[PDB]
Design an enzyme around this catalytic site. Structure first.
Site, PDB file in Angstrom:
ATOM      1  N   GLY A  41     -10.027  54.270  43.586  1.00 37.25           N
ATOM      2  CA  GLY A  41     -10.262  55.639  44.000  1.00 37.25           C
ATOM      3  C   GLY A  41     -10.421  56.578  42.814  1.00 37.25           C
ATOM      4  O   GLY A  41     -11.267  57.473  42.827  1.00 37.25           O
ATOM      5  N   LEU A  74     -26.194  80.954  32.052  1.00 39.78           N
ATOM      6  CA  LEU A  74     -27.013  81.771  32.945  1.00 39.78           C
ATOM      7  C   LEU A  74     -26.589  83.239  32.979  1.00 39.78           C
ATOM      8  O   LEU A  74     -27.196  84.044  33.686  1.00 39.78           O
ATOM      9  CB  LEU A  74     -26.986  81.201  34.373  1.00 39.78           C
ATOM     10  CG  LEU A  74     -27.998  80.094  34.696  1.00 39.78           C
ATOM     11  CD1 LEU A  74     -27.738  78.872  33.825  1.00 39.78           C
ATOM     12  CD2 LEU A  74     -27.910  79.720  36.173  1.00 39.78           C
ATOM     13  N   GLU A  76      -6.076  62.920  43.938  1.00 42.92           N
ATOM     14  CA  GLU A  76      -6.215  61.526  43.519  1.00 42.92           C
ATOM     15  C   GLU A  76      -5.343  61.322  42.285  1.00 42.92           C
ATOM     16  O   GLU A  76      -5.633  60.492  41.429  1.00 42.92           O
ATOM     17  CB  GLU A  76      -7.682  61.215  43.192  1.00 42.92           C
ATOM     18  CG  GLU A  76      -8.082  59.744  43.276  1.00 42.92           C
ATOM     19  CD  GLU A  76      -8.236  59.240  44.708  1.00 42.92           C
ATOM     20  OE1 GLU A  76      -8.474  60.059  45.625  1.00 42.92           O
ATOM     21  OE2 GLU A  76      -8.136  58.014  44.915  1.00 42.92           O
ATOM     22  N   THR A 105      -2.847  64.147  39.986  1.00 41.96           N
ATOM     23  CA  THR A 105      -3.080  65.257  39.065  1.00 41.96           C
ATOM     24  C   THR A 105      -3.217  64.732  37.640  1.00 41.96           C
ATOM     25  O   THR A 105      -2.867  63.584  37.343  1.00 41.96           O
ATOM     26  CB  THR A 105      -1.907  66.274  39.032  1.00 41.96           C
ATOM     27  OG1 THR A 105      -0.758  65.657  38.435  1.00 41.96           O
ATOM     28  CG2 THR A 105      -1.572  66.768  40.423  1.00 41.96           C
TER      29      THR A 105
HETATM   30  C1  LIG Z   1      -9.339  69.019  48.367  1.00 43.59           C
HETATM   31  C2  LIG Z   1      -8.114  68.115  48.524  1.00 43.59           C
HETATM   32  C3  LIG Z   1      -8.230  66.946  49.271  1.00 43.59           C
HETATM   33  C4  LIG Z   1      -7.121  66.127  49.466  1.00 43.59           C
HETATM   34  N1  LIG Z   1      -7.218  65.020  50.318  1.00 43.59           N
HETATM   35  C5  LIG Z   1      -6.087  64.251  50.618  1.00 43.59           C
HETATM   36  C6  LIG Z   1      -6.187  63.180  51.499  1.00 43.59           C
HETATM   37  O1  LIG Z   1      -7.272  62.909  52.012  1.00 43.59           O
HETATM   38  N2  LIG Z   1      -5.052  62.427  51.826  1.00 43.59           N
HETATM   39  C7  LIG Z   1      -3.810  62.746  51.261  1.00 43.59           C
HETATM   40  O2  LIG Z   1      -2.809  62.100  51.570  1.00 43.59           O
HETATM   41  N3  LIG Z   1      -3.719  63.821  50.367  1.00 43.59           N
HETATM   42  C8  LIG Z   1      -4.858  64.573  50.049  1.00 43.59           C
HETATM   43  N4  LIG Z   1      -4.763  65.673  49.182  1.00 43.59           N
HETATM   44  C9  LIG Z   1      -3.444  66.026  48.610  1.00 43.59           C
HETATM   45  C10 LIG Z   1      -3.265  65.558  47.164  1.00 43.59           C
HETATM   46  O3  LIG Z   1      -3.301  64.129  47.111  1.00 43.59           O
HETATM   47  C11 LIG Z   1      -1.930  66.090  46.635  1.00 43.59           C
HETATM   48  O4  LIG Z   1      -2.061  67.501  46.441  1.00 43.59           O
HETATM   49  C12 LIG Z   1      -1.500  65.453  45.311  1.00 43.59           C
HETATM   50  O5  LIG Z   1      -1.452  64.029  45.438  1.00 43.59           O
HETATM   51  C13 LIG Z   1      -0.112  65.956  44.906  1.00 43.59           C
HETATM   52  O6  LIG Z   1      -0.150  67.361  44.647  1.00 43.59           O
HETATM   53  P1  LIG Z   1       0.821  68.397  45.403  1.00 43.59           P
HETATM   54  O7  LIG Z   1      -0.055  69.390  46.064  1.00 43.59           O
HETATM   55  O8  LIG Z   1       1.796  67.659  46.236  1.00 43.59           O
HETATM   56  O9  LIG Z   1       1.574  69.114  44.172  1.00 43.59           O
HETATM   57  P2  LIG Z   1       2.959  68.577  43.547  1.00 43.59           P
HETATM   58  O10 LIG Z   1       3.051  67.107  43.695  1.00 43.59           O
HETATM   59  O11 LIG Z   1       4.043  69.405  44.124  1.00 43.59           O
HETATM   60  O12 LIG Z   1       2.785  68.933  41.988  1.00 43.59           O
HETATM   61  C14 LIG Z   1       2.692  70.298  41.567  1.00 43.59           C
HETATM   62  C15 LIG Z   1       2.553  70.407  40.045  1.00 43.59           C
HETATM   63  O13 LIG Z   1       3.661  69.715  39.439  1.00 43.59           O
HETATM   64  C16 LIG Z   1       3.134  68.617  38.676  1.00 43.59           C
HETATM   65  N5  LIG Z   1       4.062  67.464  38.686  1.00 43.59           N
HETATM   66  C17 LIG Z   1       4.507  66.820  39.764  1.00 43.59           C
HETATM   67  N6  LIG Z   1       5.350  65.858  39.396  1.00 43.59           N
HETATM   68  C18 LIG Z   1       5.445  65.889  38.070  1.00 43.59           C
HETATM   69  C19 LIG Z   1       6.148  65.149  37.127  1.00 43.59           C
HETATM   70  N7  LIG Z   1       6.969  64.175  37.510  1.00 43.59           N
HETATM   71  N8  LIG Z   1       6.000  65.442  35.826  1.00 43.59           N
HETATM   72  C20 LIG Z   1       5.201  66.417  35.427  1.00 43.59           C
HETATM   73  N9  LIG Z   1       4.522  67.144  36.299  1.00 43.59           N
HETATM   74  C21 LIG Z   1       4.620  66.908  37.614  1.00 43.59           C
HETATM   75  C22 LIG Z   1       1.810  68.276  39.359  1.00 43.59           C
HETATM   76  O14 LIG Z   1       0.973  67.579  38.431  1.00 43.59           O
HETATM   77  C23 LIG Z   1       1.290  69.699  39.545  1.00 43.59           C
HETATM   78  O15 LIG Z   1       0.896  70.239  38.281  1.00 43.59           O
HETATM   79  C24 LIG Z   1      -5.889  66.467  48.913  1.00 43.59           C
HETATM   80  C25 LIG Z   1      -5.782  67.632  48.156  1.00 43.59           C
HETATM   81  C26 LIG Z   1      -6.886  68.457  47.962  1.00 43.59           C
HETATM   82  C27 LIG Z   1      -6.721  69.730  47.128  1.00 43.59           C
END
Ligand SMILES: Cc1cc2nc3c(=O)[nH]c(=O)nc-3n(C[C@H](O)[C@H](O)[C@H](O)COP(=O)(O)OP(=O)(O)OC[C@H]3O[C@@H](n4cnc5c(N)ncnc54)[C@H](O)[C@@H]3O)c2cc1C
Ligand SMILES: Cc1cc2nc3c(=O)[nH]c(=O)nc-3n(C[C@H](O)[C@H](O)[C@H](O)COP(=O)(O)OP(=O)(O)OC[C@H]3O[C@@H](n4cnc5c(N)ncnc54)[C@H](O)[C@@H]3O)c2cc1C
Lengths: 370, 370
Positions: free
Chosen positions: B233, B329, B354, B356
């Protein structure tokens, strides 16, 4: 990599680790020309990687050649630059534009590493603008008489053969000047930030006589020959920049796994682990661009664009990696005994020679809008 | 590229250039689900690039796959995301862990593009840390009863098949749930910065019954199955990031050729020419990393490191490239009619979903010390 390519790199790795690496520090602090290292490499035919076996070389493919330069640079950037130059334009030009007699008496000893060659283009007033050098060459009954001053010549005073670029009535041409020749002179090696062992000085020519046979190819079409070899040279320097980054990287990776501060090994603090990851990504991307270029070369296709891209990215990568490599070792990264400081100093120059980053950008843009 | 690969890609360009590109603007503006584009892609088997022909796919090699996603994203990032997701984990997991009946019943319709798939893992409180998910799956009479909420689900409410990750007394498991099943509802598509046409929304499971037959693989082994398709992925998202960058880059390069200011075409202004070159370099580096991981994948080797490196790098290149594409642009770069602004909004999310960029670095670091 094929078994064969890995067999070659096995040899390069051995000489690099056994000869280049242990001697690097002493030769760097003494700014001593690396004769033991070069001889060690010549014996393995490594000063002729870019030349066919039927001309004294070992005729490697570009991919293996690129990885070899990286391996050599990772051990001693100074030794690697000299290698890339002696088996660079000098051997590139002789092979593709020299006569059977010239290839027999000049190419062979270069490829076999019996002689160290040098390329002389740069002038005190002309660098990036080679197309406007002012070294003169007038037709004298019997050959030519050269007058001028070449600067920043790698191996100057040490090389037996010098490919000097001078101007004649018909234009810029390439000449083959051997050491000893009356009139040929050498300035004292320049003191610089890095590449201490890779001596660079002025090649002074005052009324130097050159036989009609010492003329390389078409008179007035020399600058074209030079640019022809530049694409290769750039892939070569790109390869070296990767080696410089890798050399410093490996020291940092190991260090972050041994050193402890605040109760954990350095790699356990996210800041540090992230630096090691970023370093890796830069190196992987840099090498990827290098090999892609090398492969294109081997396919007989125009690779001017891919060459500047790789040179530009890798040199920037080298500078960026070494900066962080030093950082990981804290104060010790600033200490001569830890080598990363030596890589940091060497890295910066890859953004300058073989075409500055600015010039690489002009070439890239030019190619994009062709 | 081999003859067969060019044929597949030639087909990808056509649909991307004749269907995706033309419709992208209005579907982005109206935040409309891209059914027509999806149908046009389905007819070409492009919704099953990652599945073998014996299961309804076109079984392309990773390189052609990667290049195709790049091509689809360049014309419409929103459609590319849905494609990568419907043919992502939903199909990866069924193929590798599904039973004959499951693959025949679900995999085939997905690969042929008759159905759109969705992968549900993310929850309000659990995102990067999947292990801490709260979706509940209790063993009921001859089946299972699920309860919970999944958020940010791509294609939610449009997909026919949903792979829901819930936990049972034995652990996190994979569950196949068809649309229409009682208890399964959907929230309104989330209002996001970009990827407008690619609806993402909540997936509610209130006392949803799933028959014994709809369990995928061994109970409590679901999280392992998921992280298994993750490396692929990430390669796919990396490829899409490259596409987004290419899209913006092309518009800017062309514009710099047509637009004039201060008496010259923008490309004639060094600063602009250098931006174009820099965009080219990072795009080339990104692509190279992507293809390197693609090949390793095809060689059956562990490519977790190459996957994260490619995704981390390309995602960053997309943001950097689009930023400058808008800059080239000028004011028009900020205008909807000129499309670059849309690529700039879409690019940022590639550093988030997928895994961060912070997560990718942990993986890379962990992998470097494995
Ligand atoms: C357009 C879009 C499509 C998506 N589609 C799907 C889907 O189809 N199926 C699905 O299940 N999910 C989907 N998601 C969700 C996405 O997979 C999650 O947002 C992501 O995996 C985890 O981000 P979070 O929002 O939970 O932020 P968090 O996990 O809360 O993280 C927030 C911040 O803290 C950082 N962070 C977290 N843990 C640590 C660490 N241990 N050390 C340092 N930094 C850390 C993160 O990098 C980020 O900067 C989608 C999201 C978007 C925006
Ligand atoms: C360690 C080392 C080894 C070398 N070995 C050799 C050798 O063996 N043989 C040889 O012939 N030369 C050699 N050189 C010289 C090198 O090739 C030249 O330095 C280079 O080609 C031109 O740089 P310059 O010093 O003339 O700087 P200049 O050309 O004067 O440029 C100075 C600054 O202006 C920038 N610039 C120049 N023109 C433009 C432009 N049109 N647009 C935007 N920016 C511009 C340059 O990028 C640079 O930032 C070596 C140099 C070094 C440092």
């Amino acid at each position: 990599l094929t078994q064969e390519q890995r067999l070659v790199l096995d040899a390069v790795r051995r000489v690099a680790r056994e000869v280049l690496y242990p001697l690097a520090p002493e030769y760097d602090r003494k700014a001593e020309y690396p004769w033991p290292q070069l001889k060690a490499l010549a014996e393995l035919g490594l000063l002729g990687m870019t030349t066919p076996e039927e001309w004294g070389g070992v005729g490697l493919d570009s991919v293996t050649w690129a990885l070899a330069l990286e391996e050599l640079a990772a051990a001693d950037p100074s030794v690697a630059v000299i290698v890339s130059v002696t088996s660079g334009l000098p051997q590139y030009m002789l092979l593709r534009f020299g006569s059977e007699a010239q290839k027999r008496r000049y190419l062979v000893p270069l490829a076999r590493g019996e002689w160290i060659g040098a390329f002389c283009l740069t002038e005190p007033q002309a660098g990036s603008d080679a197309k406007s050098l002012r070294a003169e060459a007038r037709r004298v009954k019997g050959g030519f008489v050269l007058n001028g001053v070449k600067s920043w010549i790698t191996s100057a005073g040490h090389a037996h053969l010098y490919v000097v670029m001078a101007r004649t009535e018909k234009g810029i041409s390439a000449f083959l000047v051997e050491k000893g020749t009356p009139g040929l002179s050498f300035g004292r090696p320049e003191e610089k930030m890095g590449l201490h062992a890779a001596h660079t000085a002025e090649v002074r020519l005052e009324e130097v006589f050159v036989p009609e046979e010492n003329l390389l190819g078409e008179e007035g079409r020399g600058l074209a020959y030079a640019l022809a070899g530049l694409d290769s040279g750039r892939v070569g320097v790109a390869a070296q920049a990767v080696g410089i980054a890798r050399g410093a990287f490996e020291i940092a990776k190991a260090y972050a796994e041994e050193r402890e501060q605040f109760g954990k090994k350095l790699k356990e603090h996210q800041a540090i682990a992230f630096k090691i990851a970023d370093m890796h990504v830069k190196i992987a991307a840099a090498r990827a661009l290098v090999l892609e270029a090398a492969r294109k070369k081997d396919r007989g296709e125009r690779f001017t664009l891919e060459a500047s891209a790789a040179k530009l990215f890798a040199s920037a990568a080298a500078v960026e990696v070494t900066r962080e490599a030093v950082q990981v070792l804290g104060g010790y990264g600033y200490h001569r005994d830890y080598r990363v400081e030596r890589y940091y100093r060497d890295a910066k120059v890859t953004e300058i020679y073989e075409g500055t980053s600015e010039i690489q950008r002009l070439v890239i843009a030019r190619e994009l809008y062709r």
